[PDB]
Amino acid sequence: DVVNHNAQALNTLVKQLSSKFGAISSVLNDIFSRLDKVEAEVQIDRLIT
Amino acid sequence: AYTNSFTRGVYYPDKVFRSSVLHSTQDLFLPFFSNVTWFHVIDNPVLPFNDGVYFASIEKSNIIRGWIFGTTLDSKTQSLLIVNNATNVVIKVCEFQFCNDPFLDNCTFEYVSFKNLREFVFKNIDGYFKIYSKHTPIIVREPEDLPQGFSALEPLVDLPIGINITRFQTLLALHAAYYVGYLQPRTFLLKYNENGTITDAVDCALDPLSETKCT
Amino acid sequence: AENSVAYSNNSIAIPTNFTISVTTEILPVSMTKTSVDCTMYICGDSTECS
Amino acid sequence: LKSFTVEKGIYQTSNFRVQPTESIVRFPNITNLCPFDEVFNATRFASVYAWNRKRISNCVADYSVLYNLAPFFTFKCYGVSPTKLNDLCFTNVYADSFVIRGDEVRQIAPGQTGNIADYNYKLPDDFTGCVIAWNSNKLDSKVSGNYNYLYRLFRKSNLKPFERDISTEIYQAGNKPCNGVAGFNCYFPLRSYSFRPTYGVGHQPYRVVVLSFELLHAPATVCGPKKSTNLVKNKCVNFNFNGLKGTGVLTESNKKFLPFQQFGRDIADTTDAVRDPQTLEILDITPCSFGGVSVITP
Amino acid sequence: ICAQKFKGLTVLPPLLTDEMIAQYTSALLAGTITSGWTFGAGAALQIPFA
Numbered sequence: 060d061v062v063n064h065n066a067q068a069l070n071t072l073v074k075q076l077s078s079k080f081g082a083i084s085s086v087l088n089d090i091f092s093r094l095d096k097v098e099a100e101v102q103i104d105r106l107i108t
Numbered sequence: 109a110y111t112n113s114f115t116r117g118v119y120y121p122d123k124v125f126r127s128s129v130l131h132s133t134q135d136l137f138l139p140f141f142s143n144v145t146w147f148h149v150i151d152n153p154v155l156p157f158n159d160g161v162y163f164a165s166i167e168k169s170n171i172i173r174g175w176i177f178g179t180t181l182d183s184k185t186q187s188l189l190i191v192n193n194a195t196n197v198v199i200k201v202c203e204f205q206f207c208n209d210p211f212l213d214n215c216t217f218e219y220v221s222f223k224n225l226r227e228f229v230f231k232n233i234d235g236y237f238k239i240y241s242k243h244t245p246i247i248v249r250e251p252e253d254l255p256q257g258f259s260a261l262e263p264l265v266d267l268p269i270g271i272n273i274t275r276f277q278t279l280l281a282l283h284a285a286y287y288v289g290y291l292q293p294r295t296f297l298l299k300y301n302e303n304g305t306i307t308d309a310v311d312c313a314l315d316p317l318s319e320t321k322c323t
Numbered sequence: 324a325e326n327s328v329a330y331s332n333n334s335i336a337i338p339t340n341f342t343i344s345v346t347t348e349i350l351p352v353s354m355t356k357t358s359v360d361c362t363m364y365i366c367g368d369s370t371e372c373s
Numbered sequence: 374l375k376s377f378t379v380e381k382g383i384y385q386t387s388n389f390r391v392q393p394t395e396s397i398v399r400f401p402n403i404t405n406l407c408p409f410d411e412v413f414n415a416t417r418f419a420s421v422y423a424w425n426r427k428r429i430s431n432c433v434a435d436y437s438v439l440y441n442l443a444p445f446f447t448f449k450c451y452g453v454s455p456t457k458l459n460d461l462c463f464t465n466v467y468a469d470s471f472v473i474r475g476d477e478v479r480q481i482a483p484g485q486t487g488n489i490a491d492y493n494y495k496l497p498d499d500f501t502g503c504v505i506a507w508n509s510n511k512l513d514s515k516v517s518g519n520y521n522y523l524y525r526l527f528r529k530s531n532l533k534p535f536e537r538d539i540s541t542e543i544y545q546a547g548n549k550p551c552n553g554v555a556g557f558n559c560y561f562p563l564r565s566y567s568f569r570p571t572y573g574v575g576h577q578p579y580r581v582v583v584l585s586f587e588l589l590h591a592p593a594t595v596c597g598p599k600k601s602t603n604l605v606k607n608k609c610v611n612f613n614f615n616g617l618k619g620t621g622v623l624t625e626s627n628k629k630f631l632p633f634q635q636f637g638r639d640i641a642d643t644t645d646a647v648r649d650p651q652t653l654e655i656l657d658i659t660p661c662s663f664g665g666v667s668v669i670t671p
Numbered sequence: 672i673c674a675q676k677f678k679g680l681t682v683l684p685p686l687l688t689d690e691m692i693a694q695y696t697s698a699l700l701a702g703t704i705t706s707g708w709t710f711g712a713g714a715a716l717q718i719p720f721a
């Protein structure tokens with residue numbers, strides 16, 4: 060259980076990077092490329108939070 | 109005449125290569141152990157298309173020759189016709205009906221490019237037509253129903269047509285049996301090996317055990 | 324299993340033999356030591372996100 | 374540590390080292406300039422409610438025409454910024470070029486209710502793309518009314534979004550069966566606004582092109598005007614594959630792609646393997662920056 | 672494991688390797704066998720196991 064919990068928490072932390080958190084995309088560079096700096100910052104603030 | 113599909117109809121849902129991973133997806137799939145309709149070769153009655161059609165054919169040598177898709181099939185609107193030939197394969201969307209009964213002897217789009225088991229999946233997304241195929245033969249011990257096993261269907265044809273389809277009909281060779289099933293929105297668990305080939309799948313809504321597997 | 328001890332005013336039970344038992348007790352002492360780089364995890368190879 | 378004095382021990386240090394980047398661009402090598410003049414400079418536009426859609430597949434979409442010419446009014450783009458459209462790539466582009474009354478040009482938006490918003494310009498909830506309009510006083514305004522455009526109304530039923538259809542049958546506003554014959558509360562579908570140059574500025578006709586893009590980074594046949602440079606490997610470089618930007622070392626990979634497969638994705642659904650759009654070789658992406666080192670000091 | 676290393680998530684090794692933990696358990700076993708409880712209170716005093 061000590062091995063499995065420490066593996067499972069790291070797997071969850073890795074898999075959580077595909078989430079959008081209400082933004083348009085989970086890919087960081089796509090928001091920068093598809094939007095200008097007025098709304099790219101407010102879209103990536105959700106990802107950072 | 110009804111028969112039972114046996115863990116068949118799983119296609120590649122995207123172009124993304126994934127290696128040695130279990131991936132859960134939400135798409136129009138043929139449900140596991142569903143009830144499919146089975147026809148003999150004499151007949152080709154006209155059948156509805158719904159949200160998607162899984163087609164299968166067990167045939168001797170090129171008994172099935174093509175397909176007809178449409179809505180009214182009365183030479184007023186577009187009807188997608190696929191005819192495969194030993195020379196070359198023809199796909200057209202011509203509106204006009206040519207034969208009184210369809211058999212083997214200003215269109216907006218044209219494209220020219222029991223020993224045999226063939227599986228196909230035809231579906232439309234916003235009028236965009238996707239055709240997935242698989243061609244693996246069976247040599248001996250043909251039981252005249254769906255063979256028990258698993259295989260993955262690779263994408264072949266993408267047509268940017270925008271053509272509404274509601275009903276369809278197949279084409280037979282003239283001078284064997286075929287299977288039709290319908291796709292439903294399902295969540296599937298897919299297994300990818302080191303090659304990237306889909307080797308196993310789990311239908312999440314089939315039974316509580318597979319729901320536990322998906323959880 | 325239900326047992327009934329034969330209690331009495333003048334009655335004792337004294338063992339006439341023994342046995343030597345060896346049991347196993349298992350105790351975790353430590354776990355996996357992890358470390359997280361914050362910039363490489365959150366943004367990752369992106370200067371303007373940093 | 375945000376301190377000038379460091380105590381004795383081992384410390385994990387975040388990287389303050391500056392790594393310069395070299396931009397590498399890679400795009401499909403199609404040389405055909407896109408015929409936007411077939412959409413714009415045509416003599417007569419298409420029928421408004423017939424939903425005649427123009428398909429753009431093999432093109433170099435140069436938007437300098439869209440930005441450096443006088444007749445352009447609005448650039449209402451949803452899901453993408455118009456100012457960065459020349460840097461990306463698209464799979465298939467679709468154009469709906471019809472003529473609307475100017476006061477109804479504001480009705481071309483998803484989630485709106487109107488005669489234009491419900492029957493021909495019904496954008497879905499997940500619509501991406503741009504709406505462009507300009508004036509048509511010189512071409513689409515005629516003396517005693519222009520009859521080249523016909524419009525459909527007088528129905529309480531709304532059609533499906535992005536389903537091309539023709540309704541030649543009479544819109545049955547009344548309960549009595551019209552059966553293609555005008556009668557009580559039976560209105561013919563096609564109606565002419567009869568555009569004139571003597572009308573108001575809002576009532577003057579406007580030429581409107583709705584461009585729908587597919588913003589996926591799939592095998593793309595439409596790209597903006599940009600060169601393609603040499604593929605630098607085994608070094609920390611930027612990369613731009615079909616509009617897909619990234620930073621990292623591109624190396625040779627042994628992941629045997631299926632012939633229809635374009636991208637490889639990791640456990641975290643991040644892009645790990647790519648396919649070159651020209652040479653059709655498979656490249657592995659390794660992160661550039663080392664995350665941090667340990668400093669052992671007294 | 673390589674995906675976590677690419678994402679800023681590293682795992683540090685322990686300070687004491689398993690050979691050294693085995694040497695500690697060997698020392699404790701040898702002291703318990705050859706000296707009883709006397710090595711826990713100070714210097715080890717040899718005594719027969721009987």
Ligand SMILES: *[C@@H]1O[C@H](CO)[C@@H](O[C@@H]2O[C@H](CO)[C@@H](O[C@@H]3O[C@H](CO[C@H]4O[C@H](CO)[C@@H](O)[C@H](O)[C@@H]4O)[C@@H](O)[C@H](O[C@H]4O[C@H](CO)[C@@H](O)[C@H](O)[C@@H]4O)[C@@H]3O)[C@H](O)[C@H]2NC(C)=O)[C@H](O)[C@H]1NC(C)=O
Nearest residue numbers: 334335336337338339340341342343344345346347720721
């Ligand atoms: C307290 O309890 C202990 C045991 O916990 C008793 O001590 C003796 O313990 C030894 C083993 O620890 C016993 O020895 C064994 O005796 C067997 C005799 O079995 C034969 O006889 C009985 C009775 O007649 C028959 O029912 C049976 O079928 C047999 O015919 C031997 O067969 C055993 O030999 C095996 O093991 C030895 C190794 O020990 C091998 O070398 C042999 O080849 C063979 O495989 C074994 O020798 C012994 O029986 C116990 N003593 C008694 C009297 O039972 C204490 O006696 C007890 N104290 C009190 C006060 O109760």
Ligand SMILES: *[C@@H]1O[C@H](CO)[C@@H](O[C@@H]2O[C@H](CO)[C@@H](O)[C@H](O)[C@H]2NC(C)=O)[C@H](O)[C@H]1NC(C)=O
Nearest residue numbers: 158178179180185271272273274275533536538
């Ligand atoms: C595709 O075409 C069919 C028929 O051409 C359409 O079905 C019609 O739908 C209307 C509205 O519900 C009905 O009043 C008609 O009776 C239907 N016709 C038939 C023959 O059933 C269908 O709506 C079109 N679109 C889709 C997405 O299937």
Ligand SMILES: *[C@@H]1O[C@H](CO)[C@@H](O)[C@H](O)[C@H]1NC(C)=O
Nearest residue numbers: 110111112113141142143144
């Ligand atoms: C399929 O349907 C038929 C009747 O339509 C029924 O008799 C048969 O049991 C069904 N098969 C399955 C597997 O449910």
Ligand SMILES: *[C@@H]1O[C@H](CO)[C@@H](O)[C@H](O)[C@H]1NC(C)=O
Nearest residue numbers: 183184185203204214215216
């Ligand atoms: C093709 O010609 C027929 C014959 O008049 C016509 O009804 C139909 O609308 C035409 N289709 C196209 C797409 O031009």
Ligand SMILES: *[C@@H]1O[C@H](CO)[C@@H](O)[C@H](O)[C@H]1NC(C)=O
Nearest residue numbers: 300301302303304305307629
């Ligand atoms: C993957 O393909 C290789 C050939 O390139 C083959 O040797 C290997 O066995 C395949 N993997 C599996 C799990 O079959």
Ligand SMILES: *[C@@H]1O[C@H](CO)[C@@H](O)[C@H](O)[C@H]1NC(C)=O
Nearest residue numbers: 328329330331332333334335
């Ligand atoms: C023990 O002695 C007391 C006093 O005579 C008596 O009441 C009790 O029942 C006795 N207990 C037993 C178990 O005999």
Ligand SMILES: *[C@@H]1O[C@H](CO)[C@@H](O)[C@H](O)[C@H]1NC(C)=O
Nearest residue numbers: 401402403601650651652653
């Ligand atoms: C142009 O593209 C084709 C196919 O995409 C490729 O085979 C060829 O090498 C490319 N040429 C250059 C100069 O990039």
